[PDB]
Amino acid sequence: MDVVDIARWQFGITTVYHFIFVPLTIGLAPLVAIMQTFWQVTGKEHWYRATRFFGTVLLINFAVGVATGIVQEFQFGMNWSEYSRFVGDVFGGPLALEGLIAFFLESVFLGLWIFGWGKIPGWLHTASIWIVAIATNISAYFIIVANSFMQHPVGAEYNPETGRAELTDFWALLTNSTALAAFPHAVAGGFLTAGTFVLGISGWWIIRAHRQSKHSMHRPALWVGWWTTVVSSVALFITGDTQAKLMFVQQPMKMASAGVNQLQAAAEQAYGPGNYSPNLFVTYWSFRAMIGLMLGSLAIAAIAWLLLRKKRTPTGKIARLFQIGSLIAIPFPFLANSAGWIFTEMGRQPWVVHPNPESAGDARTEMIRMTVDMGVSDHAPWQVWLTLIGFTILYLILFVVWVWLIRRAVLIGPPEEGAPSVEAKTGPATPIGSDMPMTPLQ
Amino acid sequence: MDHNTFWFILIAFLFSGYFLLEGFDFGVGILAPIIGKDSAARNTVIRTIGPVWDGNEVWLIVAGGALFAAFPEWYATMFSGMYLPLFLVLVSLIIRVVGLEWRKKVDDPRWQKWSDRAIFIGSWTPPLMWGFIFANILRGMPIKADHTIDAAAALPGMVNVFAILGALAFTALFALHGLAFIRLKTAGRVRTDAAKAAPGVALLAAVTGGPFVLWAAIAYGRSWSWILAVLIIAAVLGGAFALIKDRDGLSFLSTSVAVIGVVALLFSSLFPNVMPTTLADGVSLDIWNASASHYALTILTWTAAVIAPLVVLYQGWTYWVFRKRLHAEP
Ligand code: HDD
Ligand code: HEB
Ligand code: HEB
């Protein structure tokens, strides 16, 4: 297999690993901030316990989210140099703005949240976690603007002298309809991920604690997760509907893969001979997966509401089935986000920059198109094989340790304390297992 | 001046902020198992950069993104020609990310030793390979007429005396920078241990960077490049000297001047070119043939001028919040 497909595989693997961890951050930084705000204003201890528990999970997720992010930015020019030349004039601006605003805000203020508990006033600590949440959303927006230029190029004009699409309208790029539709949907996807996680863990722990004050944090956290899951599901339905309407016009080949023959004919008779269709199987099953896994999250939310109404607690085999259902439902939104993005990127094929349908007539913008074969940096295939294998193995190790470490934190359970203590130096950001061996004794 | 010159200066500024902030980062990481000799001391050493290393990493991220937006041709050519060295940098950075963030998720010696291995790899590889990459940038690369580097034929050529010396110089410089940082941001026995290991780190910096900085200034620089190299050497000497006189504030400031001087030399000896070609048939990249549009540079100038000062302000405020020196429990 030649360098083009190895580079496609490397990009796909690395950034699928990245968006395994991104949605949990996008949804959970807001939820942790909300829980800490509750602890601040209400003063109740169970809110502090929820803050500590889900902030432990948040910090683990945030860690793996940063490294995978790092590779994606460079991978752009390492593996797709011709692409990185054709679009860097217009595409690189959103990346620069993301790094300059959102990445700096989230990194700096998450450092403050992890380490500056007593060094700043507590309202400022809650402000730091709120800033991290907002910054994660902003980064989502700028990245999605860049990818939406890839999907629906606007605000750019081709320059035959440089042979390169060049920026000519910044506002059209920032307010691209594809970006303004895809951003809220990714935000609701992250919120679905975090809400499903919180709901599942809290229901599992409600049952577990009933079987076994100290565990009083589970029910309020369960309702935070329930509200987040329901609201994010509704937001997902609305935003996905908007994006379906957009995809109808901008990218008819995507939906035809979710007629294909007529569009293929028009494409080859407009851009020259060659295949101009995506992988039908992958597109179809990614789109359906992007939906069924949401169905799973909604199922767990409905069952949790049925069983836990009016401060009720199941006690029979229903309790065991509910625990199992919660744990099984947790991975569903991770898989749904991955499926949706895989649908997006595979239906983008064979274009790394899609031809804007409205730009077809306009000569000064008709050349903003590019294919994947023409955008790849020409490498000796052994180099790309080496990098793909190295990244895949390192990422598998990181994901396995990540799962193990979250499982350990969850099994440890909520903190015995209800307020930060100067002794033991714990606060709303202290990880749950920070003072326990690899396998806790209890 | 022109926008192209302004964004060359801005890319140099971004890379200098990176190499400065992430420089002590890598120095602290390298010297953690060297100065610590103990779990309590090594933990404090890592805790010095704990709260602020993510922001330092971001500085690298923004350097890459701004070099992608201002100079797309430079971005593509540099990153595709130097494929495997950059892959090594990235792998080590991933390993360091997990080794630093997950370090405190588990309180167990096996977890801490695996974290230490991760920190070692991610603190050793990036300085070496960044020195390698930037020395090869300054010397030149096999750049063709289409501004493309083969990177398979070019990889053996990259392994040369100048690049190796640059790698060692970068590692020694960042070790000295991290040492001065530890002297500034610790108290108690850990600071004294850093003072104990000061001579070896200094000697290595003086004996490797000095030859490298002078060679890069003379062979591939301009008529004042020797002046700039002398300034860098004097800064290294002052940082090593101020450490001896217990001027940990001035020692870090002087090693800061040294790192920024190294970046300024690498970029001023490069300007006006951005990617010197080694192929006679091939064309070297400068701030004109490898550049963005005027409109793109205008938008970038507006956004950067508005936002970057605020970023520097609140990042400095964070560094001020975490200004208190850390101590090591017995
Ligand atoms: C919808 C949201 C979203 C999407 C589609 C992406 N990212 Fe991301 N990225 C984030 C949302 C995010 C984040 C949620 O904001 C992360 C994950 C965890 C974190 O700390 O920041 C992040 C972190 C992150 C970092 C770490 C920087 C730092 O905080 O120190 C880099 C370098 C990238 N990303 C780069 C990319 C690239 C090159 C992408 C595309 C090819 C990409 N991300 C897709
Ligand atoms: C713009 C920015 C961006 C972004 C944001 C993104 C985001 C993303 N992504 Fe991407 N990509 C890109 C840019 C991008 N991207 C590119 C450029 C490419 C090249 C072309 C291809 O490969 O397709 C890719 C590619 C790719 C792939 C492969 C496919 C093929 O076949 O080729 C995949 C799978 C993916 C996924 C993904 C995801 C999931 C996500 C979410 C996170 N991606
Ligand atoms: C979170 C989880 C989730 C969910 C649940 C969902 C759910 C949903 N969804 Fe989704 N998505 C997603 C995640 C998701 N999602 C993603 C990630 C993506 C990628 C990005 C964007 O696009 O925005 C998508 C994308 C997308 C789209 C477009 C694609 C492109 O771009 O091309 C559409 C149309 C839709 C629809 C939809 C719907 C209808 C629904 C209902 C069922 N989505």
Side-chain angles (χ1 to χ4, degrees):
Chain A
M1 173 183 42
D2 61 349
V3 65
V4 192
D5 305 300
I6 320 165
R8 290 170 62 190
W9 270 101
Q10 180 182 348
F11 207 105
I13 290 181
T14 50
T15 194
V16 158
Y17 271 106
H18 183 50
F19 211 75
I20 289 172
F21 308 121
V22 168
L24 188 54
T25 289
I26 285 181
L28 191 52
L31 293 191
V32 169
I34 295 169
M35 272 166 230
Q36 188 181 177
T37 308
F38 290 160
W39 168 57
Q40 284 279 120
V41 65
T42 71
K44 293 179 290 176
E45 294 187 354
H46 60 93
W47 286 126
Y48 171 80
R49 290 191 178 95
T51 305
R52 280 206 49 187
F53 189 81
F54 294 103
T56 308
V57 176
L58 176 70
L59 294 186
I60 300 171
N61 186 240
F62 210 92
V64 175
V66 170
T68 58
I70 301 178
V71 171
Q72 314 310 329
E73 88 156 356
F74 299 100
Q75 187 173 199
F76 271 126
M78 311 201 321
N79 288 104
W80 307 92
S81 72
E82 294 294 328
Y83 172 74
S84 178
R85 287 186 174 96
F86 185 75
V87 307
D89 188 293
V90 64
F91 173 97
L95 268 57
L97 278 45
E98 196 203 16
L100 191 56
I101 318 167
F103 285 164
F104 268 119
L105 281 169
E106 76 194 20
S107 300
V108 161
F109 285 94
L110 197 40
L112 294 174
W113 191 72
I114 304 175
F115 296 83
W117 157 240
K119 299 176 162 30
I120 66 185
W123 71 264
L124 190 50
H125 201 87
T126 308
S128 292
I129 183 62
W130 271 118
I131 292 166
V132 172
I134 298 165
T136 59
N137 276 10
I138 297 168
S139 70
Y141 167 69
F142 281 125
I143 283 285
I144 283 170
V145 168
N147 185 254
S148 293
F149 176 78
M150 288 170 52
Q151 306 282 351
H152 179 247
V154 293
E157 271 170 41
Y158 182 72
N159 190 0
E161 294 294 328
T162 319
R164 159 189 70 177
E166 301 182 335
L167 183 65
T168 184
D169 191 10
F170 191 46
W171 190 251
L173 178 75
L174 286 186
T175 66
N176 185 6
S177 60
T178 315
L180 296 181
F183 162 61
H185 200 63
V187 177
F191 272 95
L192 184 66
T193 304
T196 305
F197 178 86
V198 168
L199 184 61
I201 295 295
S202 297
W204 183 83
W205 258 110
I206 286 186
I207 306 299
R208 182 180 187 89
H210 185 42
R211 292 180 181 177
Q212 277 160 27
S213 69
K214 159 59 181 56
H215 287 61
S216 60
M217 60 79 71
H218 294 119
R219 194 169 295 269
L222 179 137
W223 291 124
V224 173
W226 189 91
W227 275 112
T228 309
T229 307
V230 166
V231 172
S232 59
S233 302
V234 172
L236 279 161
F237 178 76
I238 297 156
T239 54
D241 186 74
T242 300
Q243 266 164 257
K245 310 173 187 306
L246 278 190
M247 182 179 72
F248 179 70
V249 176
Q250 304 176 352
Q251 280 168 318
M253 185 64 73
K254 272 192 180 179
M255 177 139 57
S257 51
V260 58
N261 292 344
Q262 293 79 10
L263 290 177
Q264 177 69 243
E268 59 209 12
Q269 73 194 11
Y271 322 117
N275 175 18
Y276 279 127
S277 60
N279 199 337
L280 274 297
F281 172 91
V282 171
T283 300
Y284 189 113
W285 279 122
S286 45
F287 195 85
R288 313 317 162 93
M290 185 209 315
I291 316 307
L293 300 162
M294 173 203 211
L295 189 147
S297 301
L298 282 165
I300 197 64
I303 297 169
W305 186 82
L306 283 172
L307 272 56
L308 279 299
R309 262 169 307 103
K310 310 304 182 301
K311 280 73 176 175
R312 288 158 45 256
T313 302
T315 179
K317 187 179 179 54
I318 296 302
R320 192 46 183 172
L321 271 294
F322 178 68
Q323 257 185 334
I324 300 307
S326 305
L327 293 183
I328 298 308
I330 285 175
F332 273 68
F334 297 87
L335 301 174
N337 287 293
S338 298
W341 264 116
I342 286 174
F343 163 76
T344 306
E345 306 299 87
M346 298 283 181
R348 185 172 39 80
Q349 302 309 300
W351 306 94
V352 63
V353 176
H354 201 262
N356 200 338
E358 50 192 358
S359 178
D362 186 11
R364 64 182 293 165
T365 62
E366 65 183 1
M367 288 291 97
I368 316 292
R369 66 173 183 264
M370 175 159 279
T371 57
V372 183
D373 301 1
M374 294 299 291
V376 66
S377 69
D378 189 6
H379 278 81
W382 58 273
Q383 282 176 323
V384 192
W385 274 120
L386 191 161
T387 63
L388 173 50
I389 298 173
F391 277 140
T392 308
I393 302 309
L394 173 59
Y395 280 167
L396 183 52
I397 298 177
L398 296 188
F399 173 84
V400 169
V401 181
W402 174 81
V403 170
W404 175 90
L405 191 62
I406 294 171
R407 175 185 181 273
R408 172 200 188 248
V410 163
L411 265 64
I412 299 177
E416 297 281 349
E417 67 171 358
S421 65
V422 179
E423 300 76 15
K425 293 187 286 185
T426 79
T430 298
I432 297 294
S434 57
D435 61 340
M436 282 156 207
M438 281 189 70
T439 300
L441 310 178
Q442 310 313 123
Chain B
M1 46 183 153
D2 187 11
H3 268 259
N4 303 5
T5 305
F6 183 67
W7 269 107
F8 186 93
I9 300 176
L10 274 193
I11 297 306
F13 159 80
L14 281 182
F15 266 116
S16 60
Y18 170 66
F19 282 132
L20 172 69
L21 295 173
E22 207 67 55
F24 60 73
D25 288 347
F26 296 143
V28 165
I30 286 180
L31 303 171
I34 306 177
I35 299 181
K37 301 288 96 176
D38 169 40
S39 296
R42 198 196 199 289
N43 281 343
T44 305
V45 168
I46 301 300
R47 207 200 329 164
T48 65
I49 67 176
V52 290
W53 75 262
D54 208 358
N56 312 357
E57 159 217 349
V58 165
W59 268 91
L60 169 60
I61 294 318
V62 171
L67 193 149
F68 192 11
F71 304 106
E73 311 279 327
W74 183 13
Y75 180 87
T77 310
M78 162 166 59
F79 285 3
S80 288
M82 293 180 183
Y83 189 56
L84 287 187
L86 274 173
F87 172 70
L88 294 185
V89 175
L90 289 185
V91 166
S92 62
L93 282 181
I94 304 161
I95 297 169
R96 187 177 67 109
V97 163
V98 294
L100 295 172
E101 294 293 328
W102 285 350
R103 182 169 184 81
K104 300 289 94 176
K105 302 321 168 195
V106 173
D107 190 11
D108 187 284
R110 290 174 289 119
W111 184 266
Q112 181 175 357
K113 100 184 174 184
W114 270 110
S115 169
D116 288 342
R117 292 193 169 102
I119 292 175
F120 169 93
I121 295 172
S123 305
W124 274 95
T125 306
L128 281 162
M129 295 300 291
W130 279 132
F132 191 80
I133 287 174
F134 272 76
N136 276 278
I137 287 303
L138 182 53
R139 212 192 76 144
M141 291 277 306
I143 304 159
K144 292 181 181 179
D146 53 18
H147 318 275
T148 285
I149 304 175
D150 196 10
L155 181 49
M158 290 177 78
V159 176
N160 64 7
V161 176
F162 183 63
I164 299 305
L165 168 67
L168 308 176
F170 267 57
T171 303
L173 178 68
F174 294 160
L176 179 60
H177 199 45
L179 177 65
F181 183 79
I182 294 171
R183 305 281 290 141
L184 181 57
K185 280 215 60 183
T186 60
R189 73 169 196 274
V190 170
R191 201 182 178 273
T192 62
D193 306 347
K196 175 182 180 301
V201 178
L203 189 149
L204 276 176
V207 71
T208 300
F212 168 71
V213 65
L214 284 154
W215 182 357
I218 293 176
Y220 316 95
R222 275 69 174 174
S223 311
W224 33 272
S225 296
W226 75 258
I227 316 176
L228 192 49
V230 167
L231 305 173
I232 296 159
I233 299 180
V236 160
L237 285 176
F241 152 80
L243 192 154
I244 301 299
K245 300 287 97 175
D246 297 0
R247 312 294 294 177
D248 47 359
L250 294 174
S251 177
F252 180 74
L253 174 61
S254 186
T255 318
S256 313
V257 171
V259 175
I260 312 284
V262 171
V263 185
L265 180 52
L266 265 288
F267 274 86
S268 65
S269 61
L270 174 60
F271 193 85
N273 289 7
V274 63
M275 188 68 61
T277 187
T278 307
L279 309 180
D281 185 18
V283 47
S284 64
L285 279 63
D286 57 39
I287 67 169
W288 301 287
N289 55 1
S291 182
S293 296
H294 178 86
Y295 183 83
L297 291 180
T298 288
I299 292 303
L300 287 169
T301 313
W302 277 115
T303 61
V306 172
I307 304 163
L310 310 175
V311 173
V312 176
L313 282 177
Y314 68 69
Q315 182 162 350
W317 162 70
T318 295
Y319 271 89
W320 157 268
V321 171
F322 299 111
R323 75 192 170 278
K324 184 150 163 93
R325 291 169 184 257
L326 302 181
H327 299 73
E329 294 295 341

